[PDB]
Amino acid sequence: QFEERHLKFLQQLGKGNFGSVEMCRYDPLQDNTGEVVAVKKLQHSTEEHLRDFEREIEILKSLQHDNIVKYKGVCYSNLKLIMEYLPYGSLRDYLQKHKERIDHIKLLQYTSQICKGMEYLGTKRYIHRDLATRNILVENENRVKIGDFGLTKVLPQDKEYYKVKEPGESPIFWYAPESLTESKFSVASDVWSFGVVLYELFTYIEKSKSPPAEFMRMIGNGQMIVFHLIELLKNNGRLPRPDGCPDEIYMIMTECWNNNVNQRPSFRDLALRVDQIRDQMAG
Numbered sequence: 445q446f447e448e449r450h451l452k453f454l455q456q457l458g459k460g461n462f463g464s465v466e467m468c469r470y471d472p473l474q475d476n477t478g479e480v481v482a483v484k485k486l487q488h489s490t491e492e493h494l495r496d497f498e499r500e501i502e503i504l505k506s507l508q509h510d511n512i513v514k515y516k517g518v519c520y521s522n523l524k525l526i527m528e529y530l531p532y533g534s535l536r537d538y539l540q541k542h543k544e545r546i547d548h549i550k551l552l553q554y555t556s557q558i559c560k561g562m563e564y565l566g567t568k569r570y571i572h573r574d575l576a577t578r579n580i581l582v583e584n585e586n587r588v589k590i591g592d593f594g595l596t597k598v599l600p601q602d603k604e605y606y607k608v609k610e611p612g613e614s615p616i617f618w619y620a621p622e623s624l625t626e627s628k629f630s631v632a633s634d635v636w637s638f639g640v641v642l643y644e645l646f647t648y649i650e651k652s653k654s655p656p657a658e659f660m661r662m663i664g665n666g667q668m669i670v671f672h673l674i675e676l677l678k679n680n681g682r683l684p685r686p687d688g689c690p691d692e693i694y695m696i697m698t699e700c701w702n703n704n705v706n707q708r709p710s711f712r713d714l715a716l717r718v719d720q721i722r723d724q725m726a727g
């Protein structure tokens with residue numbers, strides 16, 4: 445649908461080891477009347493990374509949900525993924541900036557939208573593998589969307605987990621212990637990560653309170669990090685309750701952080717509990 449020549453670069457939205465997102469204007473009439481869009485491309489395109497990117501594109505294209513960033517199309521000379529542009533950006537940066545304006549009732553509305561997005565994923569047998577507030581996007585004051593799917597895998601038909609160990613840098617501080625020790629990824633490791641996302645929110649993204657900073661303090665400030673992490677978690681070492689967090693929200697977090705994969709709640713039970721807590725804060 446999109447031509448490379450009609451896509452004008454406006455700014456960088458985020459750069460990683462394997463990907464980059466840009467704000468661009470798609471202006472086919474060249475009269476500065478096209479819509480601003482978000483454009484994801486590989487930064488150092490391997491052919492494996494390209495094949496993964498093609499699948500990421502096919503995943504996003506197959507998703508249609510209020511809390512999932514919209515697919516617009518592809519563009520090539522090559523491959524670019526064109527998405528809707530969300531003007532408020534990542535929940536992470538948005539929470540950090542507007543922390544004095546965002547109360548707990550709002551945090552739980554975001555939380556509940558993230559669960560519904562995640563339940564819709566698990567419905568297609570997709571495992572996200574990268575739930576973090578940096579990958580959640582703010583559409584408006586009342587709406588968040590899951591906004592990146594670079595690490596998302598389809599479960600095979602005959603299995604409820606997927607095994608994979610990619611080279612380089614893994615977000616280890618959001619990983620369930622069976623993902624660190626066995627490279628096993630399931631709906632339940634996504635639930636583990638969701639618990640860490642909930643922790644993030646309730647910390648209001650206070651610099652020294654992030655999971656990397658907290659687990660590093662607990663371990664002791666290279667390759668040895670994951671080993672010490674694994675041991676800490678097996679001993680039931682865990683992220684502290686955030687400042688001002690209710691016992692009942694922290695209970696949800698700690699339940700998400702069960703070492704017993706099978707004892708972790710489902711996404712729809714998470715949504716029931718959160719929506720129940722929300723109503724007991726309002727009415």
Ligand SMILES: O=C(Nc1nc2cccc(-c3ccc(CN4CCS(=O)(=O)CC4)cc3)n2n1)C1CC1
Pocket residue numbers: 457458459460461462463464465482484485513527528529530531532533534578579581591592594
């Ligand atoms: O960011 C803004 N809008 C906006 N719209 C969209 C629409 C789709 C996707 C994103 C988006 C999602 C994630 C990121 C972070 N990260 C960049 C490197 S990677 O490995 O490629 C993917 C991970 C960056 C941008 N965004 N971001 C506003 C604040 C300036």
